[PDB]
Structure formats: C-alpha cells, structure tokens
Amino acid sequence: MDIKINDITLGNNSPFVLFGGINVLESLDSTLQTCAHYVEVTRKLGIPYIFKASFDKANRSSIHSYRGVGLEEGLKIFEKVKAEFGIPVITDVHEPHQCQPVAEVCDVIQLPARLARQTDLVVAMAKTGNVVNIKKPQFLSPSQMKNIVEKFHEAGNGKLILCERGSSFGYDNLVVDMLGFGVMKQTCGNLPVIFDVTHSLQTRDAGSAASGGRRAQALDLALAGMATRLAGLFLESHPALPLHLLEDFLIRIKALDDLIKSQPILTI
Amino acid sequence: MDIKINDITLGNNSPFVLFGGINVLESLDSTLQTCAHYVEVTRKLGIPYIFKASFDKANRSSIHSYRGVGLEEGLKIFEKVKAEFGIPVITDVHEPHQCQPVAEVCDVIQLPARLARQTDLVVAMAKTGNVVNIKKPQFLSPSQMKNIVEKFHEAGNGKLILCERGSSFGYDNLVVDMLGFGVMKQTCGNLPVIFDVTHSLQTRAQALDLALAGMATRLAGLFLESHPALPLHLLEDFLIRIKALDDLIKSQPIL
Amino acid sequence: MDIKINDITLGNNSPFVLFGGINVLESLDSTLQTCAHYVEVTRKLGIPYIFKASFDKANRSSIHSYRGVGLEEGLKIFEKVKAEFGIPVITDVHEPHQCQPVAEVCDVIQLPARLARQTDLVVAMAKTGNVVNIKKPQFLSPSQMKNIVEKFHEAGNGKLILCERGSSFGYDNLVVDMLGFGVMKQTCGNLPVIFDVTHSLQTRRRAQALDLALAGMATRLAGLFLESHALPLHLLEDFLIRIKALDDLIKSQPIL
Amino acid sequence: MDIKINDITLGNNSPFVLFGGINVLESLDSTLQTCAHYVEVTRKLGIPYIFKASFDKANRSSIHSYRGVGLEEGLKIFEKVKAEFGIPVITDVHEPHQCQPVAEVCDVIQLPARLARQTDLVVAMAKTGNVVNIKKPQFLSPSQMKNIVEKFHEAGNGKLILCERGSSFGYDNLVVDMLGFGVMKQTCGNLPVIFDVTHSLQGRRAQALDLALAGMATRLAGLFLELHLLEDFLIRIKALDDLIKSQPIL
Ligand SMILES: [Cl-]
Ligand SMILES: [Cl-]
Ligand SMILES: [Cl-]
Ligand SMILES: [Cl-]
Ligand SMILES: [Cl-]
Ligand SMILES: [Cl-]
Ligand code: NA
C-alpha cells in the first residue's frame, strides 16, 4: 500500500524517502539553516525529503533539557519550512489534545514508541486523518505491530507508516532484525516500512560502553536495511552522522535503493 | 535507605512488604471483597500490606476493551479502602495532570515502565512529594536505573522504590536477572527494591518458585496480583512460604 | 527421581549436595590440600560432598596454557582423593575413548555443554552405566534438555543429572532463568537438577555468587556446583552456612 | 587480506564466493548430482563456487538416525567431486585426529561454532596449513573473534575466514547483527568474512533472500546458501554484490 504525501509517493516499491532534521525546534532561523542543508543535499541527488523536528519533546535525557519552542511557535516554524522549501514535514505528538492543531500543519504525525499502545493518543491521532508514523517499540516483536495497526483501523485511519528502531538485545542496547521488516510487511498489509537507523544506534538502555565499537558501522546498517526493500530511511545529520559525509552516505543508499527497487519482487 | 509509609517501614533489611491486589478497579464491592481477603490474610501472618489496583488500563489491545472505572470513580474507591481498612494504597499514573489529584488520595504513586523516560510525568510525580514506585523497564539494564533515580532527585523527591519486572529476552519473553537486584541496591543508594513477580511472568507453580528466588536476594517487598495473576484462595499458602524464606534471609547478617 | 552416589542420595527433595573443587588438576599435593579444606568444612556442617576437577581442560585462554595433568595421572590423583577422603568424585570427558577408563574411577562423569548434542559421546557415556552430569548449553533452552535425556535413555542409561550454567544474554553475557529449573524438572521426569553458579557468573564477586546461589536453591534443587581457587577457598564455610540454611528451610516444607 | 583458493580470490573487496552444497554426504551419485546443479548455475552467472558437505552428522535427534557416509567414504566422495568438477571443497571437522587426513583432500576445513574454544582442535586445524573457516559462536560479540584469530596465528596459520551464523536471541531463536561484519573486519585484520545465511535462519524462501541481501550489503567475501530458486536468488545477490564492490570504501 502506498501513501501519497503531497507530491511524494511513499511505499515499499517506490524510491526511498529520506526523513531527517533536528532534534528539537529552537527558532525559525536555526531551523531553516539546518533544513536547507538537507534540502540542498537531497536535491543534488533527486531524493524525496521530509523534514523532522520536535516542537515539544517529552523524553529527553534530562528533565531540564530544552523541550522545544512549543506548539504555537513550532507550528509557525513548520509553516515557514513548508512554504520556503515546498517539502512535507513530520513531528511527534504525545498529548491527545495536541493532535488536531498539529495536523492542520504537519503532513505526518508521529506516535512515540513508548506510547504506541496508549489508547487515548492512538484514537486522537487517528481522528486527525493525517498520515501517521508508528514507531516500533524496542520491546515489541515485529508480529505485534499488527495490533497497533488494528487500533488505528478501529479508530478510522489506514494511512500508516511502520518505523523500525531496533530491538532490545541483552543489556547491549539494540540489535536490528533484518527479518522483522518482512514480518511487518506480511502481517500489516504491506504498509510503508521505514528504518530509523539513528535510533537503532541509541545507548540509553545499557550506556554507551555496552555498544563497544559497533555504532561506527552505521552506513552498513542503513545499507543492510534498505537491501530488504523499504519505503524510507530516518536519519539525523549535523556538521548523528556529519554533513560532509551526508552526500556520500546518500549516494550509497540511493545506489542500492535504485538497484533493489528496479527489480521485481521474487517469483511465486 | 528505608521509607516510612504510614506505620510501615519499607527497606531492604526490613520484613518484606506485600504490594498486592488486582489488575484494574471494576466496582466498589468487588474491590472491598478482594482487599478484605488480602487484609485478613496479611494481618494474621503479620505481613505489612499495601493494596494495589489500576483505575484505568490505558494500553489494552482494542479501543473498545473495558478500561476499568476511571480516575474519578477510582479515587472514590481508594478513599473507601483506606477508610475501611486503614492501609496504604498504590496506583499507577499515566498523565502529568493526574498526579496531584491521585496523590491526594493514594499513598504510593507508580511510574509505568513504558513511561519511565517521560520527563513531564517524572516532574509531575516528583512534585507531589508522595512515595513513588519506579517500574524498571524490561529494556533497561539494572546499572541504568540510576538514571531514572537521578531525574527524580533533580525534581526534588528521594522517596523512591525500585521495582523489578523482568528483562526482555528475545521476542515476546522475559527473564529475571537475579543479579540485578544487588546492582540496583549498589548503584542507587540502597533504596528499597521490590519484585513484581506477576508481570515478570508475561509469557503456574512458577510464580512461587520465581518469587522465592527473588526474595532470596534480600528485598524490601513483593508485588503481586490475584484474581477471584495468582488464584486468590492460594494467597495464604503462597505467603506462608514467602514469609518463611524472608524471615530466614532477613535473620542472616549481611555479608 | 533420586540417584544414589555411594552413600549420598541426590535428588530435588533431598539435602543439597555440593559438587566442588577446582578448575584443572595441576598437581597432587595442592589438590589434596584443597580437597581437604572442602572435606573439613562439609563434614563440619553435615553437607554431602563430591570433589570436582578436570584432568584435561580443552577450554583454555591460550593454546599453550597448561591443559592439566591428563588422563592417566588425573585418574591416579582421583584415586588418591577417594582413598584418602572416602568421597565421590566427578570429572568431565571430551572423547568417546575416554569414557571407560574415566568411568572406572570417577563416580560421576560429565558431558561438557559444547558436546551435549554429540551423539557418539552421548552413546559412549550412556554405555558406561555410570551416573552422568549433563551440562545445559548456554544456547539451549530448558525444554530442549528432554531431547538429550531421551538419547541417553535410548542408549540405556537413566542415571542422569541436569546442570544449569546460565543462558546467553546479548553478547558475552549470561543470565540464569530461575524458571528453567522447573521446566527441566517437569519435562525430564524430575531427574536431579544442580546449579553451576561458578560458570553462571563467568561473565560478570563473592556477594554475587551468594545472591545467585541462594536464588537458585530457593527453587528446590538437588545440588550446587562450584569452583574455588571462582570463590575464595577460606570463605567456603560462611558461604555454605547460608546455603544450607536456605536449603534446609525449603526442603523441610512440602512442595506447593 | 585476500586468500587464494586455487584460481579463486576470496576477499572482502573481491566478487563474492558462493559456498554451498548439502547437509550430509549420503552417496556418491546424489552428491555429484547436487554439485553439478550448483556448478551449472554458478558458471552461467559467473560466480566462484566452493562445494560444501559434512561427512558426518555429529548431532542427530535419535541414536538410530542416519549419520552420513563417514570420514573414509566421505573423503573418497570429495576426491571425485574435485576430479570431476575442478572446484575446491569445504567440510567441517570435529576431532583433532580427523584434521590431517581431511586436509589432505579438502581445500577448506571448518571449525564448528560450538567447538571454537576447543584449543586442541584449533591447534590441529592450524597445523594442517589449510585455509580454515572459523564459524562464530552464537554467544560471542563480533570483537571477540580476534581472540580465536590470535590462537590460530600463534599456532602458525593465518589463512583464516570468519563466518557469521547469527547470535542467540532469547530461547530457540537467532538474530544477525549487521553491525558485526564491520567489527570483525576492523578488529581481525580484514580477513575474509562470509555469511552462513542457512544456519542463521533458525515464505521462508523470501526470508533467506532478504537476509542474504542485507548481509551482502555490508561488503563481504562470500555467502553460504542451500522452480529455479538457486539461480533466482543468485542473480539478485550478484547484482547487489557487484554494485557494492564497485563503490569505494567509506
Ligand atoms: Cl535530570
Ligand atoms: Cl522503544
Ligand atoms: Cl502494575
Ligand atoms: Cl517494560
Ligand atoms: Cl565444569
Ligand atoms: Cl555453553
Ligand atoms: Na564410576
């Protein structure tokens, strides 16, 4: 099943879409500057791009870390991003009451992994009728995603993206099961699957030392996921991977994606 | 560090405290019946007791599933439990705005495991000044519980209980690392550690074996659910065993 | 099901049996001294005791680490232990050809975890007719132990002990699933289940070994398997006092 | 570091090599038939090929299960495969005494994962001087492969292949950590790394293809694989391998 996002077609048989941006919105000027870097690199390669940021992030690593400019100013920033660059945008919500006003502006709304079973939020997000990105909790098996999808369907919204972010592996933070992508596609009606490679490399479960040198293998992880035929890649980059590297990185991802997406799926 | 909850002393070198009750509040009358059973059993066995129930199941599998009586009616039920039996109670909170009104009634308020990183919720719970029960996420290493404890300390509340509920073990399965208890005690200032045996068994006579094993490591409390979950009529027999072990362990000097 | 090992009764409802000793037989005099310390302490506390050591350790940290005294001299050392102290002994085997000569001397023979699905070794061990200790591999689940037990039964030997040593948990780490003991008892005919606390900790000390040991023994087990040099040898008495306390309590109550 | 196996170059920047065949050798005729199929498919696609089989099934579910032809007859069959098809072969060894006679015939000898810490087996395999395929244990972090490599080096054999076969994930289940390939390359001197997709897989056809594609995207020396399913698979794997190998390393 494909999802149309303005001009973009998002789907597991379509050219991959890049989701990226900044962690939290600070100001119009800082946002436009960072967005412009992604837009310039993606335009150089012809890759569809959706800008991501949080306006009120409730799960930062300290309780006084800045949560973002907030709903009213955040939406004004997102409006300007859409107008200036002509791209769609994506943000997370965590309060049911925020869903409707966010959905007036933001093309895709995101269901934080920790909240993925929270019924009042699921309903409120569903009722917006917007595209929704469902983050797969690290503690949920891929064959359980169908239950979250079922709740969205019960609440009347089928425009759903499934977002892989890794699975809990010992006290070693996260491992990504490359088979989980296929399990999701098969059980959830071939909804668009996207791969959050950045959060798959998170180390808040066990601390950074428990991940050893393994996180340096991030291009590899991205390539490996995209080899399984995916609608998109969710990826953070700042001058997260560095920006001199972003073009080189996307060249490799686009090469693989183009190769994969050009071949018919295996005969049956 | 010990925590006083009314007349109860909760701590890792004190007689274990039972946090027991039910999944979800469904009516006044069923709640009082179940709680009466727990009170009568625990009083005769001499086991300190805190009554547990959720007022809302916020993450059931269908949007049409029964969620329980809800906040307003749930607090009325908890007020009646406290009046009738004179015991403390515990319930979970899911939204920052629920924290102050829940804390006015419920002695202990509980941070759900999946919400343990929600900073707005941590702050709102902390501000209540109530005793807090921190459910350890299945995806968190025991040496990282300190990170949650640090947030509560920064928010000005140190009356914290650490609650084991198992660790993810592959897909759809949990294991309880019996060494984690000691890791939590050493790295979190010997705050009370309690064991949620019920949720640790998320896919028998297995509950007793697992409870015994956890309590062998010397813990402040046991957290469990029954249904009229352990069959309610087996409660007394179950607790006799747990108390026999707890008494023995607690009588041995710490090494 | 109980197993008699000389005058010892091993079983999940009997007083726990300590299986203790050392990693690798490296000498005669030092072996006897260490064994003597275990004997003195277990006799003082009334705890049944079986001395454990490897004669050939195929597991070493370097290619030229000493592998141990070997079969012939190792069996001689075991003979001396048995003559001097009058206790049973246990050791591991790695090759079918070693089964007979080791079984003639040793009261229990051990199947290494890595070899637990090696059919030729299983058959050769079964055919000795000796008591066998089956080490549960860290990569095998507790409900698969019944398949190893079946192979021994097909080969004619039912005098089997199941030994827990933890399960793989992420990378380079072990966790002991306290529920596995019950799964093994239920699916394998209530054969004796013992807990190798030493090897269950090898990726993680004294206070840890105690907590883990107590936790396991709370589940009602036939025995505890440990190495010293590994627990410091002088702390053996204190450690066993606490284990025996819990074991006596548990074992004195009927099963629920 | 590349390894030459006859006229095959095996390395992490070379065209991938297919290791495949059958589980356990049962007869000459069925072995030659299966091998001929792999040869015909790999030749027409231009993929280097090494034939794999065990002479013995060391783990069977019953004591009375069929065990395979055994060492003596197994080596006679491997000799005939090499004479008929002119390809290298690979088999596993389980006992030190088997190492020298197997190495006389088999180009690559394999260290089973469960036996990777058996020091006497390592030494005996090293002393053959043959190319060795080291199967990574399901509990070991990829950085710990360096400790096994060190042992082989100290025993005088540097012709080593590291082989991924998945990692234990709870009970009775495996996961392949796609980050581990790079870790093994970086910590073990860029020895060839190959991916045992068959044993990593605790329809199922489509799963094997997804997993194989994902691992080969990390840039590997080779792969193990068990109406024309082999060729359809290989066509896709070769397409991806060729693309990956044509990009400079980042
Ligand atoms: Cl903080
Ligand atoms: Cl998560
Ligand atoms: Cl709960
Ligand atoms: Cl959890
Ligand atoms: Cl041992
Ligand atoms: Cl093992
Ligand atoms: Na004997």
Side-chain angles (χ1 to χ4, degrees), chain A residues 263 266, chain D residues 16 41 45 47 197 201 206-213 223-225 228-239:
Chain A
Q263 301 173 241
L266 191 73
Chain D
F16 89 98
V41 174
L45 297 177
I47 298 166
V197 57
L201 285 163
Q207 285 203 306
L209 178 60
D210 279 358
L211 190 58
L213 292 170
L223 183 69
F224 278 71
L225 286 175
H228 306 271
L229 271 40
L230 180 62
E231 83 185 14
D232 296 339
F233 243 79
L234 295 175
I235 287 171
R236 291 166 161 88
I237 303 302
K238 186 182 188 304

Tab-separated table of all heavy atoms in Angstrom, chain A residues 263 266, chain D residues 16 41 45 47 197 201 204-213 223-226 228-239, unseen atoms left out:
chain	number	residue	atom	x	y	z
A	263	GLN	N	14.089	-4.030	-9.540
A	263	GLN	CA	13.895	-5.431	-9.807
A	263	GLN	C	12.529	-5.831	-9.279
A	263	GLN	O	12.109	-5.361	-8.211
A	263	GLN	CB	14.949	-6.260	-9.085
A	263	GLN	CG	16.370	-5.879	-9.511
A	263	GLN	CD	17.444	-6.574	-8.700
A	263	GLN	OE1	18.266	-5.953	-8.008
A	263	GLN	NE2	17.481	-7.827	-8.814
A	266	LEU	N	10.740	-11.233	-5.867
A	266	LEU	CA	10.884	-12.693	-6.193
A	266	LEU	C	9.594	-13.490	-6.654
A	266	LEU	O	8.489	-13.377	-6.074
A	266	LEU	CB	11.534	-13.384	-4.998
A	266	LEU	CG	12.062	-14.811	-5.054
A	266	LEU	CD1	13.359	-14.950	-5.862
A	266	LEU	CD2	12.294	-15.356	-3.637
D	16	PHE	N	31.937	-11.838	-4.671
D	16	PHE	CA	31.610	-12.831	-3.619
D	16	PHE	C	31.754	-14.254	-4.128
D	16	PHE	O	31.496	-14.541	-5.324
D	16	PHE	CB	30.203	-12.593	-3.031
D	16	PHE	CG	29.072	-13.292	-3.734
D	16	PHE	CD1	28.573	-14.468	-3.261
D	16	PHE	CD2	28.489	-12.719	-4.893
D	16	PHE	CE1	27.511	-15.106	-3.889
D	16	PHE	CE2	27.490	-13.386	-5.563
D	16	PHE	CZ	26.956	-14.532	-5.039
D	41	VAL	N	24.732	-23.611	-12.460
D	41	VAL	CA	24.167	-22.277	-12.126
D	41	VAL	C	25.224	-21.236	-11.864
D	41	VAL	O	25.145	-20.133	-12.422
D	41	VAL	CB	23.188	-22.308	-10.936
D	41	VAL	CG1	22.757	-20.887	-10.551
D	41	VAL	CG2	21.938	-23.122	-11.317
D	45	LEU	N	26.259	-17.797	-14.292
D	45	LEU	CA	26.186	-16.478	-13.741
D	45	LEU	C	27.557	-15.869	-13.463
D	45	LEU	O	27.639	-14.708	-13.083
D	45	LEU	CB	25.440	-16.508	-12.430
D	45	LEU	CG	23.979	-16.950	-12.575
D	45	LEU	CD1	23.371	-17.009	-11.213
D	45	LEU	CD2	23.197	-15.988	-13.440
D	47	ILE	N	29.861	-16.740	-11.093
D	47	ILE	CA	30.094	-16.675	-9.603
D	47	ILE	C	31.064	-17.803	-9.182
D	47	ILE	O	30.812	-19.000	-9.436
D	47	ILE	CB	28.755	-16.855	-8.854
D	47	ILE	CG1	27.783	-15.714	-9.207
D	47	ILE	CG2	28.993	-16.920	-7.354
D	47	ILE	CD1	26.331	-15.962	-8.805
D	197	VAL	N	23.988	-17.876	5.771
D	197	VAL	CA	22.590	-17.496	5.860
D	197	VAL	C	21.734	-18.673	6.301
D	197	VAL	O	20.817	-18.470	7.048
D	197	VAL	CB	22.086	-16.795	4.574
D	197	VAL	CG1	22.248	-17.586	3.362
D	197	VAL	CG2	20.622	-16.419	4.660
D	201	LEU	N	19.193	-18.832	9.874
D	201	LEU	CA	17.723	-18.841	9.787
D	201	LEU	C	17.152	-19.874	10.680
D	201	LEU	O	16.620	-20.825	10.203
D	201	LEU	CB	17.267	-19.090	8.354
D	201	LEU	CG	17.422	-17.935	7.415
D	201	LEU	CD1	17.345	-18.375	5.963
D	201	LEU	CD2	16.330	-16.890	7.703
D	204	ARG	N	9.579	-18.793	3.590
D	204	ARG	CA	10.957	-18.906	4.071
D	204	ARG	C	11.977	-18.643	2.954
D	204	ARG	O	13.103	-18.216	3.222
D	204	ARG	CB	11.220	-20.295	4.678
D	205	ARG	N	11.580	-18.888	1.704
D	205	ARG	CA	12.416	-18.570	0.541
D	205	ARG	C	12.733	-17.059	0.484
D	205	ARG	O	13.898	-16.641	0.341
D	205	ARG	CB	11.726	-18.998	-0.769
D	206	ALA	N	11.684	-16.251	0.632
D	206	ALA	CA	11.807	-14.815	0.579
D	206	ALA	C	12.647	-14.313	1.800
D	206	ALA	O	13.350	-13.305	1.673
D	206	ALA	CB	10.437	-14.163	0.563
D	207	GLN	N	12.573	-15.010	2.942
D	207	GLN	CA	13.344	-14.599	4.140
D	207	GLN	C	14.807	-14.777	3.931
D	207	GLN	O	15.592	-13.909	4.336
D	207	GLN	CB	12.970	-15.383	5.410
D	207	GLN	CG	11.651	-14.959	6.019
D	207	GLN	CD	11.531	-15.308	7.529
D	207	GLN	OE1	11.717	-16.484	7.955
D	207	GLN	NE2	11.195	-14.282	8.350
D	208	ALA	N	15.214	-15.944	3.407
D	208	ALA	CA	16.593	-16.229	3.115
D	208	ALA	C	17.101	-15.145	2.163
D	208	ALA	O	18.225	-14.724	2.289
D	208	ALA	CB	16.767	-17.610	2.499
D	209	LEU	N	16.294	-14.723	1.186
D	209	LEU	CA	16.792	-13.726	0.190
D	209	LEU	C	16.984	-12.360	0.858
D	209	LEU	O	18.018	-11.753	0.713
D	209	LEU	CB	15.816	-13.559	-0.970
D	209	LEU	CG	16.201	-12.544	-1.998
D	209	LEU	CD1	17.521	-12.860	-2.649
D	209	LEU	CD2	15.114	-12.470	-3.035
D	210	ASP	N	16.020	-11.940	1.644
D	210	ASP	CA	16.134	-10.663	2.372
D	210	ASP	C	17.365	-10.676	3.275
D	210	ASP	O	18.128	-9.688	3.304
D	210	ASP	CB	14.921	-10.348	3.198
D	210	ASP	CG	13.787	-9.758	2.434
D	210	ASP	OD1	13.905	-9.532	1.232
D	210	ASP	OD2	12.771	-9.449	3.136
D	211	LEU	N	17.541	-11.754	4.070
D	211	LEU	CA	18.678	-11.808	4.959
D	211	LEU	C	20.038	-11.817	4.253
D	211	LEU	O	20.960	-11.108	4.660
D	211	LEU	CB	18.535	-13.024	5.863
D	211	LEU	CG	19.477	-13.146	7.025
D	211	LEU	CD1	19.377	-11.953	7.953
D	211	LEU	CD2	19.170	-14.379	7.866
D	212	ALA	N	20.143	-12.632	3.176
D	212	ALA	CA	21.337	-12.665	2.343
D	212	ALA	C	21.674	-11.317	1.709
D	212	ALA	O	22.830	-10.871	1.769
D	212	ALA	CB	21.195	-13.707	1.266
D	213	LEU	N	20.665	-10.652	1.173
D	213	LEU	CA	20.855	-9.313	0.601
D	213	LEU	C	21.353	-8.283	1.662
D	213	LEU	O	22.349	-7.559	1.407
D	213	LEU	CB	19.621	-8.791	-0.061
D	213	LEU	CG	19.179	-9.524	-1.345
D	213	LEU	CD1	17.822	-9.075	-1.757
D	213	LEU	CD2	20.178	-9.259	-2.479
D	223	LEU	N	29.199	-15.973	0.727
D	223	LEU	CA	27.897	-16.376	1.246
D	223	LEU	C	27.815	-17.921	1.281
D	223	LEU	O	28.260	-18.538	0.313
D	223	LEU	CB	26.831	-15.873	0.177
D	223	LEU	CG	25.380	-16.114	0.515
D	223	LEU	CD1	24.956	-15.267	1.665
D	223	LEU	CD2	24.388	-15.760	-0.600
D	224	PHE	N	27.130	-18.507	2.262
D	224	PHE	CA	26.589	-19.892	2.222
D	224	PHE	C	25.092	-19.941	1.896
D	224	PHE	O	24.332	-19.327	2.601
D	224	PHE	CB	26.566	-20.536	3.591
D	224	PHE	CG	27.853	-21.129	4.036
D	224	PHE	CD1	28.879	-20.355	4.360
D	224	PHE	CD2	27.994	-22.473	4.141
D	224	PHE	CE1	30.049	-20.903	4.773
D	224	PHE	CE2	29.172	-23.041	4.566
D	224	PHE	CZ	30.191	-22.240	4.887
D	225	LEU	N	24.676	-20.699	0.878
D	225	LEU	CA	23.263	-20.969	0.545
D	225	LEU	C	22.914	-22.426	0.264
D	225	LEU	O	23.643	-23.086	-0.502
D	225	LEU	CB	22.830	-20.255	-0.698
D	225	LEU	CG	22.604	-18.761	-0.640
D	225	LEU	CD1	22.298	-18.197	-2.035
D	225	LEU	CD2	21.489	-18.347	0.308
D	226	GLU	N	21.801	-22.907	0.857
D	226	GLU	CA	21.149	-24.186	0.469
D	226	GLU	C	20.099	-23.967	-0.637
D	226	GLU	O	19.937	-24.852	-1.474
D	226	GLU	CB	20.466	-24.829	1.696
D	228	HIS	N	13.211	-22.391	-10.127
D	228	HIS	CA	14.682	-22.339	-10.249
D	228	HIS	C	15.215	-21.430	-9.151
D	228	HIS	O	15.743	-20.345	-9.433
D	228	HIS	CB	15.154	-21.858	-11.668
D	228	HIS	CG	14.587	-22.644	-12.813
D	228	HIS	ND1	15.194	-23.781	-13.321
D	228	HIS	CD2	13.463	-22.462	-13.553
D	228	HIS	CE1	14.453	-24.275	-14.302
D	228	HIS	NE2	13.401	-23.489	-14.468
D	229	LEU	N	15.059	-21.858	-7.891
D	229	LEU	CA	15.179	-20.936	-6.835
D	229	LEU	C	16.626	-20.515	-6.655
D	229	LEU	O	16.840	-19.365	-6.368
D	229	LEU	CB	14.655	-21.430	-5.506
D	229	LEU	CG	13.182	-21.182	-5.198
D	229	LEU	CD1	12.294	-21.395	-6.411
D	229	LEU	CD2	12.766	-22.103	-4.051
D	230	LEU	N	17.602	-21.410	-6.802
D	230	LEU	CA	19.006	-21.027	-6.585
D	230	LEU	C	19.429	-19.973	-7.559
D	230	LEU	O	19.994	-18.954	-7.186
D	230	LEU	CB	19.951	-22.225	-6.757
D	230	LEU	CG	21.441	-21.936	-6.555
D	230	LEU	CD1	21.685	-21.466	-5.130
D	230	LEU	CD2	22.306	-23.172	-6.886
D	231	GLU	N	19.115	-20.170	-8.818
D	231	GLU	CA	19.542	-19.179	-9.764
D	231	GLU	C	18.859	-17.858	-9.552
D	231	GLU	O	19.497	-16.831	-9.676
D	231	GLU	CB	19.540	-19.658	-11.160
D	231	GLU	CG	18.244	-19.593	-11.853
D	231	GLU	CD	18.236	-20.213	-13.253
D	231	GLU	OE1	19.138	-20.950	-13.701
D	231	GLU	OE2	17.207	-19.975	-13.882
D	232	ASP	N	17.551	-17.857	-9.228
D	232	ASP	CA	16.834	-16.579	-8.974
D	232	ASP	C	17.393	-15.795	-7.818
D	232	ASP	O	17.557	-14.573	-7.881
D	232	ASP	CB	15.362	-16.848	-8.595
D	232	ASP	CG	14.571	-17.479	-9.665
D	232	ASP	OD1	14.929	-17.406	-10.878
D	232	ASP	OD2	13.486	-18.074	-9.284
D	233	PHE	N	17.775	-16.528	-6.767
D	233	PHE	CA	18.461	-15.958	-5.655
D	233	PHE	C	19.798	-15.350	-6.034
D	233	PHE	O	20.071	-14.244	-5.703
D	233	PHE	CB	18.786	-17.069	-4.675
D	233	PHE	CG	18.159	-16.956	-3.372
D	233	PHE	CD1	16.827	-17.325	-3.184
D	233	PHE	CD2	18.937	-16.641	-2.304
D	233	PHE	CE1	16.259	-17.317	-1.912
D	233	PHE	CE2	18.411	-16.595	-1.054
D	233	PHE	CZ	17.070	-16.934	-0.848
D	234	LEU	N	20.652	-16.147	-6.677
D	234	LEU	CA	21.987	-15.736	-7.034
D	234	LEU	C	22.042	-14.571	-7.976
D	234	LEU	O	22.944	-13.746	-7.917
D	234	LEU	CB	22.795	-16.888	-7.545
D	234	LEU	CG	23.090	-17.980	-6.545
D	234	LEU	CD1	23.825	-19.158	-7.207
D	234	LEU	CD2	23.907	-17.522	-5.337
D	235	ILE	N	21.088	-14.518	-8.910
D	235	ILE	CA	21.031	-13.363	-9.795
D	235	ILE	C	20.949	-12.065	-9.006
D	235	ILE	O	21.652	-11.048	-9.280
D	235	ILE	CB	19.861	-13.506	-10.756
D	235	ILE	CG1	20.173	-14.566	-11.808
D	235	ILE	CG2	19.505	-12.153	-11.394
D	235	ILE	CD1	18.981	-14.932	-12.691
D	236	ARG	N	20.089	-12.081	-8.004
D	236	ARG	CA	19.870	-10.870	-7.175
D	236	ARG	C	21.040	-10.539	-6.270
D	236	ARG	O	21.360	-9.415	-6.093
D	236	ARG	CB	18.617	-11.060	-6.305
D	236	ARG	CG	17.379	-11.059	-7.209
D	236	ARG	CD	16.153	-11.576	-6.502
D	236	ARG	NE	14.932	-11.166	-7.199
D	236	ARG	CZ	14.352	-11.825	-8.165
D	236	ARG	NH1	14.872	-12.980	-8.598
D	236	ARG	NH2	13.208	-11.339	-8.676
D	237	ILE	N	21.645	-11.585	-5.700
D	237	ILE	CA	22.789	-11.424	-4.846
D	237	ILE	C	23.943	-10.871	-5.659
D	237	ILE	O	24.607	-9.974	-5.210
D	237	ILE	CB	23.230	-12.732	-4.160
D	237	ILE	CG1	22.162	-13.399	-3.321
D	237	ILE	CG2	24.505	-12.531	-3.371
D	237	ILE	CD1	21.611	-12.599	-2.263
D	238	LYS	N	24.186	-11.416	-6.854
D	238	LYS	CA	25.277	-10.933	-7.655
D	238	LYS	C	25.088	-9.447	-8.046
D	238	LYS	O	26.049	-8.703	-8.117
D	238	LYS	CB	25.488	-11.820	-8.930
D	238	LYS	CG	26.695	-11.440	-9.734
D	238	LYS	CD	26.835	-12.287	-10.966
D	238	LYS	CE	28.146	-12.060	-11.705
D	238	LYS	NZ	28.408	-10.670	-12.088
D	239	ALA	N	23.871	-9.093	-8.376
D	239	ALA	CA	23.551	-7.678	-8.745
D	239	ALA	C	23.948	-6.743	-7.608
D	239	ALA	O	24.670	-5.727	-7.793
D	239	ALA	CB	22.083	-7.524	-9.092
